[PDB]
Design a protein around this ligand. Structure first.
Ligand code: ZN
Ligand code: ZN
Lengths: 132, 571
C-alpha cells in the first residue's frame, strides 16, 4: 500500500483534471485507505550489488537512494539485475537473466526478437566480461 | 574626510544641540559605506526629518517658513530614502520589508500638498509609487508633470517605464516617440538609451534594441567608474549609477544572444565579469554567467559556477534554487531536484532548511519525506505554529488518517486557541466520514469566536467554519428527501454575508479579491441550485442568479473568467 498511496497522491492532480473526476478519485482513495490502514507487506531485503554499502535495498526498489547506482532492467520478466548472470545481444543490448530465460524457454530476445541461440550469447557475454 | 569631520563635530559638541543637517550628513555617510546596516541610515534619516519637522511646526507658513521648511532639503531626504531601494526591486513593484520607499513617498506627498508646483517632487513621487507597486499613482503623477510641463522629457520617459512595466507597450512607444523629438542631447544620456533598449527588447525588436545598445555602448561606460566615484555633475531624479551600467552590459549580452551572436555575447559578458568584480555585482554577474551559459547549451560550466558559490555567500540559496530549477526541467529528473535541497540541509542545518525541503517535497509530492523534515523542524523550532499547520497538512495528505487525527487531537489539547487547527481537523474528520465528532468539534469553536470581529483573517476563519458546517449539514441528507433544510439555508446566508464583509475588508486594504468574488459567485450558484432542487421558487432563483451575474461582472472578469458565466447561463 505504500506504492498505492504514492500513485494515488500522484493521480490527484497530474496537470489538469475536472472536479468530478478528482472527486471520485479521492472517494476511491478514502474508501481504500479507511477500510484498513496502509500496511507494508514484508519481503526479502537482498544485499545490494551496485555498491559496497551494507545497507540492503528492497527487491522492488530500483531507485537505490543515497548511492546513485541504478539497476539495469531485465526485459525477460522485469526483475532488476541482482546477480552475475546477465547477458545481452548485439541488437538491443538489454541485460538478460539466465534463470528467467530457462524458466520461460525463450528462443528469441524478448524485445527485439533476435533469432540466434541464447546459450551462445551467454558464453559470448561471459567471454566479454572476462575481457573486462 | 566627511566622516572624520562629523566625528570631530560630535566630539566637540558633546553638549551641542542635535540638528537635522548633522543627522542627514551621518545618514549619507552611512549610505556610502558597504558594511553598514540600512536600519542605521533609516533611523538617521528619521531623526533628521523629525527634527526638521519639529523646527517647522512651531510656526505659520509665510516666506520665512518655506525657507525653514526647505523643500529642497526634504527632497534630498526623500532621495536618500529612495537610494536604499535597488532599481530591480524598484521596477518589480516589491517594496522592501523596511518600508523606506513608503516613507519617502509620504514625505513627497507632504511636499506636494504644501507645494503642488514642484515638478521634481512629482517625479520622485511617481518613482516611489512605482516602487511600491502603485503603477496607476505613478502614472497620475507623471500626467501631472506633463500637464504642468509638456516639455518635461523625464516625464515622458517615466511614463514609458510605467507603461512598459504594465505591459502597455503601445503607450510606452508613444511616450518614447514624444521623448525622441523632445530633446536630441538626451540621446547621449545613458539612462534614456537603457530605457529605449529595455522597451525595444520587451517589444521583440531585437535589431533595434541591438543598435540602440551599441550606441549605448559607445557612450561613457568605461568612464562611468570614475564618474561614479567622483559624481560632480548636474544630476536629478534620474541618476546614472553603476547598477544601470551593469544592466546595460547584461541586456546587451542578452540581445546578442537572441540574435544568434553567441561569440560576441560571450566576449561582452567576459568583459562584464571583470568590470564589476568586488561588490555584489560580481556574484550577480556570476549568476548571469550561469544563466547565459545555460542559454548557450553549455550546462556543465553553469552547474560548476552555481556550485562554486561558497557557504558564506548570501546568494547561495538563490544559486541552489536556480540550479535545481534548470536541473528538473532540462535534465528531467526529480532525484537531483530533491538532492539540491537535501545538500543545503546536511551542509549546514538551520531554522528554515527543513522548511524549504518540505516545500520542495510538496512541489514534487513526496508527503512522507516532507513530513519527516517538518517534524525535524518542529524538533528544532519549539512552537513555530506555521510548522504545526504544515505538519498537519502533510499528515492529512499522506493518506494515514489515524496518526493525523491523533496529532490534531493532541495539538488541540495543548492549545485550544488555534482556529486553523480546528478547521483542518474538521476537514480531516469529514474526509474520514465521521460526522458526529466532526460537528461536535465544529459547532462549539465556531460558535465561540465572536469577539474578534474587526480582524479580517478571523472573519475569514468564521466564514470557512460556517461553510464547512453547511457542507456537513448537506452531507447528512439521505437520498429521496424533498424537504427544505432551513438551517443549512441560514448558515449559507451567514456565510455569504461574511464573505461580502471580508471582500470589503480586502478592498480597504488594497488586496486582490477577485478570487473571493469568484468563490462567492460559485457559492451563490450552489445556493441557487440547492433552492431550485427542492422548491420551485422561480422568482427568487432568478433574482439570486441575476445578483450573482452582476456581482461577478466587476474588474477584468469579462475575459479571464468564463466558466462562471457559463454555469450561470446554463442555470
Ligand atoms: Zn546500494
Ligand atoms: Zn535484444
Amino acid at each position: 500500500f505504500r506504492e498505492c498511496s504514492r500513485a494515488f497522491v500522484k493521480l490527484q492532480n497530474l496537470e489538469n483534471i475536472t472536479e468530478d473526476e478528482k472527486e471520485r478519485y479521492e472517494a476511491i482513495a478514502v474508501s481504500i485507505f479507511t477500510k484498513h490502514p496502509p500496511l507494508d507487506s514484508p519481503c526479502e531485503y537482498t544485499p545490494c550489488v551496485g555498491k559496497n554499502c551494507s545497507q540492503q535495498v528492497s527487491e522492488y526498489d530500483i531507485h537505490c537512494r543515497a548511492c546513485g547506482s541504478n539497476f539495469s532492467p531485465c526485459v525477460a520478466s522485469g526483475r532488476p539485475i541482482f546477480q552475475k548472470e546477465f547477458y545481452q545481444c548485439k541488437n538491443c543490448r538489454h541485460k538478460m537473466i539466465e534463470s528467467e530465460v530457462s524458466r520461460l524457454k525463450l528462443y528469441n530476445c524478448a524485445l527485439c526478437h533476435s533469432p540466434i541461440d541464447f546459450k551462445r550469447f551467454t558464453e559470448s557475454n561471459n567471454n566479454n566480461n572476462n575481457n573486462i | 574626510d566627511a566622516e572624520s569631520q562629523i566625528d570631530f563635530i560630535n566630539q566637540t559638541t558633546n553638549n551641542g544641540e542635535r540638528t537635522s543637517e548633522i543627522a542627514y550628513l551621518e545618514a549619507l555617510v552611512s549610505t556610502k559605506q558597504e558594511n553598514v546596516d540600512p536600519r542605521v541610515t533609516i533611523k538617521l534619516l528619521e531623526e533628521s526629518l523629525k527634527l526638521h519637522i519639529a523646527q517647522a511646526n512651531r510656526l505659520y507658513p509665510s516666506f520665512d517658513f518655506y525657507i525653514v521648511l526647505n523643500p529642497d532639503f526634504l527632497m534630498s531626504l526623500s532621495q536618500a530614502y529612495f537610494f536604499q531601494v535597488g532599481m530591480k526591486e524598484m521596477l518589480a513593484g516589491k517594496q522592501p520589508q523596511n518600508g523606506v520607499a513608503s516613507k519617502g513617498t509620504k514625505l513627497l506627498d507632504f511636499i506636494i500638498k504644501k507645494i503642488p508646483g514642484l515638478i521634481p517632487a512629482y517625479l520622485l513621487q511617481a518613482k516611489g509609487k512605482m516602487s511600491m507597486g502603485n503603477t496607476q499613482e505613478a502614472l497620475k503623477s507623471v500626467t501631472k508633470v506633463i500637464e504642468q510641463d509638456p516639455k518635461n522629457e523625464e516625464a515622458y520617459i517615466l511614463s514609458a517605464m510605467i507603461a512598459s512595466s504594465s505591459k502597455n507597450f503601445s503607450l510606452a512607444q508613444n511616450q518614447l516617440q514624444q521623448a525622441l523629438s523632445n530633446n536630441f542631447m538626451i540621446r547621449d544620456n545613458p539612462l534614456f538609451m537603457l530605457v529605449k533598449g529595455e522597451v525595444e527588447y520587451a517589444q521583440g525588436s531585437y535589431q533595434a534594441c541591438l543598435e540602440t545598445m551599441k550606441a549605448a555602448y559607445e557612450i561613457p561606460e568605461v568612464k562611468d567608474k570614475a564618474n561614479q566615484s567622483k559624481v560632480v555633475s548636474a544630476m536629478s531624479v534620474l541618476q546614472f549609477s553603476d547598477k544601470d551600467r551593469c544592466s546595460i552590459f547584461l541586456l546587451y549580452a542578452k540581445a546578442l544572444q537572441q540574435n544568434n551572436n553567441s561569440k560576441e555575447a560571450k566576449k561582452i559578458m567576459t568583459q562584464a565579469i571583470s568590470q564589476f568584480t568586488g561588490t555584489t555585482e560580481e556574484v550577480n554577474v556570476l549568476i548571469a554567467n550561469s544563466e547565459i551559459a545555460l542559454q548557450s547549451g553549455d550546462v556543465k560550466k553553469a552547474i560548476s559556477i552555481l556550485k562554486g558559490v561558497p557557504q558564506e555567500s548570501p546568494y547561495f540559496l538563490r544559486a541552489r534554487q536556480i540550479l535545481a530549477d534548470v536541473y528538473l526541467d532540462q535534465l528531467r529528473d526529480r532525484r537531483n531536484y530533491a538532492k539540491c535541497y537535501a545538500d543545503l540541509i546536511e551542509i549546514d542545518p538551520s531554522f528554515d532548511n527543513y522548511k524549504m525541503l518540505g516545500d520542495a517535497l510538496m512541489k514534487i509530492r513526496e508527503p512522507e519525506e516532507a513530513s519527516r523534515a517538518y517534524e525535524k523542524a518542529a524538533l528544532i523550532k519549539p512552537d513555530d505554529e506555521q510548522i504545526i499547520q504544515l505538519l498537519g497538512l502533510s499528515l492529512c495528505q499522506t493518506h494515514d488518517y489515524n496518526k493525523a487525527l491523533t496529532y490534531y487531537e493532541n495539538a488541540l489539547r495543548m492549545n485550544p486557541k488555534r482556529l486553523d487547527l480546528i478547521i483542518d481537523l474538521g476537514k480531516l474528520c469529514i474526509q474520514i466520514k465521521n460526522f458526529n465528532r466532526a460537528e461536535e468539534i465544529l459547532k462549539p469553536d465556531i460558535f465561540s469566536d465572536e469577539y474578534q470581529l474587526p480582524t479580517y483573517q478571523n472573519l475569514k476563519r468564521n466564514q470557512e467554519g460556517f461553510y464547512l458546517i453547511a457542507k456537513l449539514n448537506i452531507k447528512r441528507t439521505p437520498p429521496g428527501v424533498f424537504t427544505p433544510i432551513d438551517m443549512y439555508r441560514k448558515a449559507l446566508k451567514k456565510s455569504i454575508q461574511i464573505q461580502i464583509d471580508v471582500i470589503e475588508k480586502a478592498k480597504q486594504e488594497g488586496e486582490d479579491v477577485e478570487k473571493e468574488r469568484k468563490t462567492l459567485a460559485d457559492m451563490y450558484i450552489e445556493l441557487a441550485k440547492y433552492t431550485n432542487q427542492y422548491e420551485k421558487n422561480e422568482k427568487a432563483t432568478l433574482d439570486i442568479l441575476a445578483e450573482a451575474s452582476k456581482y461577478t461582472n466587476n474588474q477584468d472578469t469579462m475575459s479571464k473568467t468564463v466558466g462562471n458565466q457559463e454555469k450561470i447561463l446554463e442555470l
